[PDB]
Every structure is written in structure tokens, then in C-alpha cells.
Amino acid sequence: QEKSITIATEGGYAPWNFSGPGGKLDGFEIDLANALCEKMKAKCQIVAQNWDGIMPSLTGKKYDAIMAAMSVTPKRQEVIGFSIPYAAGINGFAVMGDSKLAEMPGLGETYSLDSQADAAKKAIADISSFLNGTTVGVQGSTTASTFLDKYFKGSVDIKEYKSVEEHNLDLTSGRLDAVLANATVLAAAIEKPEMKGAKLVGPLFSGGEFGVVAVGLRKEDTALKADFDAAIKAASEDGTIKTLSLKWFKVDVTPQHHHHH
Ligand SMILES: [Cl-]
Ligand SMILES: [Cl-]
Ligand SMILES: [Cl-]
């Protein structure tokens, strides 16, 4: 009876999905896939693969599902099917603890830009005047880069970087006073030893503009989408996602109801 589906991942984006000794895949998405497959009553094989042909391999029926921090976009929806989201994009600020900026009492608030925009707009105003005149770092060509441009332009000096590590290295130096980045990336980076003193400050921002992550499936595989959708829904309500999210990321990525069928 039981379905045997192959799940593809990148294997090079810790703590979401990362490589092992001979071939042991680990991370948030691996523990989540194992959990969803148990909810589905399916046998699953997780394979790591270069993103290049992940993709023609899925449309070619070599793979049946993709779990590689894959954002739902209008372009991807034209070519592939998507499950309901299993993670929502979250951005936050990090400063050095010994700095006067380390006390934005907006900790540890979490505001949706879609369902709590009122609380979000009031919070970004509190921040814009606290951060007034400061040099804020960000990785160029991201949702955090766009967010900082839309709401924090004029209030702060914005410096774009080509990696999170490069802006984090200039925060410890004093070159930058604050960084804004994906909260899963940020909490991981501040665990590095040359990153001691740095801490997550102010509120967490979630919303559709930060994107959402879901399972990539064949556009024709409507039954597999129905199976993933039921398991994702159950994993969201019983707190399986919150658990794994906090375990790997120290932040809760569980999405909201409005990102439904
Ligand atoms: Cl584990
Ligand atoms: Cl098959
Ligand atoms: Cl959901």
C-alpha cells in the first residue's frame, strides 16, 4: 500500500539542510520531511543534489518532492506545484550587547506584516528613531534589503553586502551599528565564536513580503499535494514545526492560516 516517494534537497544551507560524513543529510527540513512522511504514512528517501537539475529531475519523475528552503513565487507556480507553506520568512536586528542600541524593549515581540501591520508600523517607527542616524548593514538583493529600503531609508545609512558573514564581521568592528537579516541565518551566525557579544534585538518581522517556503511538487501530482497539505496542516496545529524550528533556528518559522488552499 504505503507510498515510497523520493525527496530532493540541496544539502548546503545549514541549519535548514546540510551534508554529513559519507552521505548523512541533517537539519530542519530533514527532521521536518521525516515528520511529514510519518504523518502521511509514507516511506521517504532524502537525496542531496546540485540545484542545477533538481527540477528537470522532479518533472522527469526521478524525484517526487523538493524541500530546499524553496520560496513560493509567481514564476515557479507556472511550472511546478507547491504545497501550503511550512515556514514563513522572518527578519530581525542584531547589534553588539555592549552598545547602547542593545536595549530596544521590542524583545521578544513578533509581528506579521499581513495580519498585524498596525503593530508592525508602530514598532518600525519606534526603531527608525532609536536607529536614527546609525549605519545599518544588510545582504544586497534580499527581502531584508527591500524591507530596509521601504521603511528605514532616510532614517539610517544602508550598506549592502554580498554575504551575511561580511556584514556580521563589520558589526563586531564598529563599522556598522546594526545588521538586519533573516532571523534563522542571524541566530546561527551569532553562535560563531568570533561573533561573541552580538545579540538578537527588537521585534521579529514576518510577512508575505519576506516570502514563504513550501514543498515543490509536479504540477500534475494533485494527490501528493493533498497528502503534504494535510500533514503540513497537522504539523502546524500540533506544534511539530514550532519544536523543530526552535531546535535548529532558536526562532519559530511556523506560517499563518491566510497562506491556505
Ligand atoms: Cl537529529
Ligand atoms: Cl517513482
Ligand atoms: Cl500552513
Residue numbers in the entry: 21 to 281
Can you provide the manuscript's text about this entry?
Two Agrobacterium ABC-transporters and their cognate periplasmic binding proteins (PBPs) OccJ and NocT import octopine and nopaline/octopine, respectively. Recognition and import of opines are conferred by periplasmic binding proteins (PBPs) and their associated ATP-binding cassette (ABC) transporters. The PBP OccJ is associated with the octopine transporter of octopine-type A. tumefaciens while NocT is associated with nopaline uptake in the nopaline-type A. tumefaciens. OccJ shares 47% sequence identity with NocT and belongs to cluster F within the PBP structural classification.
We report the X-ray structures of the unliganded PBP OccJ and its complex with octopine as well as a structural comparison with NocT and the related PBP LAO from Salmonella enterica, which binds amino acids (lysine, arginine and ornithine). The mature PBP OccJ (256 aa without the signal peptide) expression plasmid was obtained by cloning the occJ gene lacking the first twenty residues of the signal sequence that serves for localization to bacterial periplasm. The X-ray structures of the unliganded and liganded OccJ with octopine were solved at 2.35 and 2 Å resolution respectively. The liganded form adopts a closed conformation whereas the unliganded form adopts an open conformation. Indeed, superposition of the two structures results in an average RMSD of 4 Å for all Cα atoms and a structural comparison shows a 49° rotation around the hinge region of the C-terminal domain (residues 112–226) upon ligand binding once the N-terminal domains (residues 21–107 and 234–276) were superimposed leading to a movement of 10 Å for Thr163.
